């Protein structure tokens, strides 16, 4: 089955718009990773007024003269602060006043961080992170689009930054499937160009096993799975960049059980508005943000627990 809901524009003129997130007060944010100054990265985290779509710069992260490429966001639970995956700087924690901190320059083995693109909290508070880029600044920016050097990290509640896997070709969206009792059960990771969704079984903080292909992304277009989010029934909605569709997987994966046709070819990121059926989706055909109504509420995010 294929559904065609009405998409309503939220805001426009945001190059590479991604990282949609709601904070603990219901303020909406997205990131503009392609902002430059003199050919060098100067990406921005924006706050969006939901009534007018007007954009307000919250944070323009730069460290020692190297500008960031903010790319994916999650809201914290114990504090109204945003965990931001940055393709040049690693993991940031951003405050609403625009100040920010770099969380880990090196991983638990002492090795320089790779640039990060998506992240997802489990309900225990560990942050699972995809890192499709090469070494963080001051190294030259590189991207694992053709070669298998993308990595997967877990930033645990004890404050450890643990590389839990590597050798992905452009890992993208990440999400955590929880049991009904709240325990983390599977980690889902998009590997975009291979048209695969991978899963592992979560055994504990930064402990994953049983790596397997969890789902297959339709199509042969350039692109594949980008962002993803679970609904309250643990159906996984996955933006299939390049396909004009968002794929809907059942909780056990496999093939899509349904698809959502989009009025654009390039959906990227998606995020539920808490306590509603409204999905916000970003897309790079119009460099815009849209919303549409899903069949049921989103899965509760860590920040709402």
Numbering used by the authors: 4 to 308
The article reads:
These enzymes make use of 4‐benzoylphenylalanine (BpA) as a genetically encoded triplet photosensitizer. Our own lab used this approach to develop photoenzymes (EnT1.3) for enantioselective [2 + 2]‐cycloadditions of quinolone derivatives by positioning BpA into the hydrophobic pocket of the computationally designed Diels‐Alderase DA_20_00.
Structural analysis of CEnT1.4, coupled with molecular dynamic simulations, reveals a well‐sculpted active site pocket that pre‐organises the substrate for regio‐ and enantioselective catalysis. The BpA244 photosensitizer sits with the carbonyl group directed away from the bulk solvent, as in structures of EnT1.3. Molecular docking of the product (+)‐1a and the substrate 1 into the crystal structure of CEnT1.4 reveals binding geometries similar to those observed with (‐)‐1a‐bound EnT1.3, with 1 and (+)‐1a in close proximity to the BpA photosensitizer and forming hydrogen bonding interactions with Q195 and Y121. The CEnT1.4–1 simulations show a major population (∼90%) of the substrate pre‐organized for selective catalysis in a well‐sculpted active site pocket formed by hydrophobic residue F37, L146, V148, V225, V271 and BpA244. The substrate also forms a hydrogen bond with Q195, has a C H – π interaction (edge‐to‐face π stacking) with BpA244 but does not form hydrogen bonding contacts with Y121. In agreement with the simulations, a Q195A mutation leads to a substantial reduction in activity and reaction selectivity, consistent with hydrogen bonding between this residue and the substrate being important for selective photocatalysis.
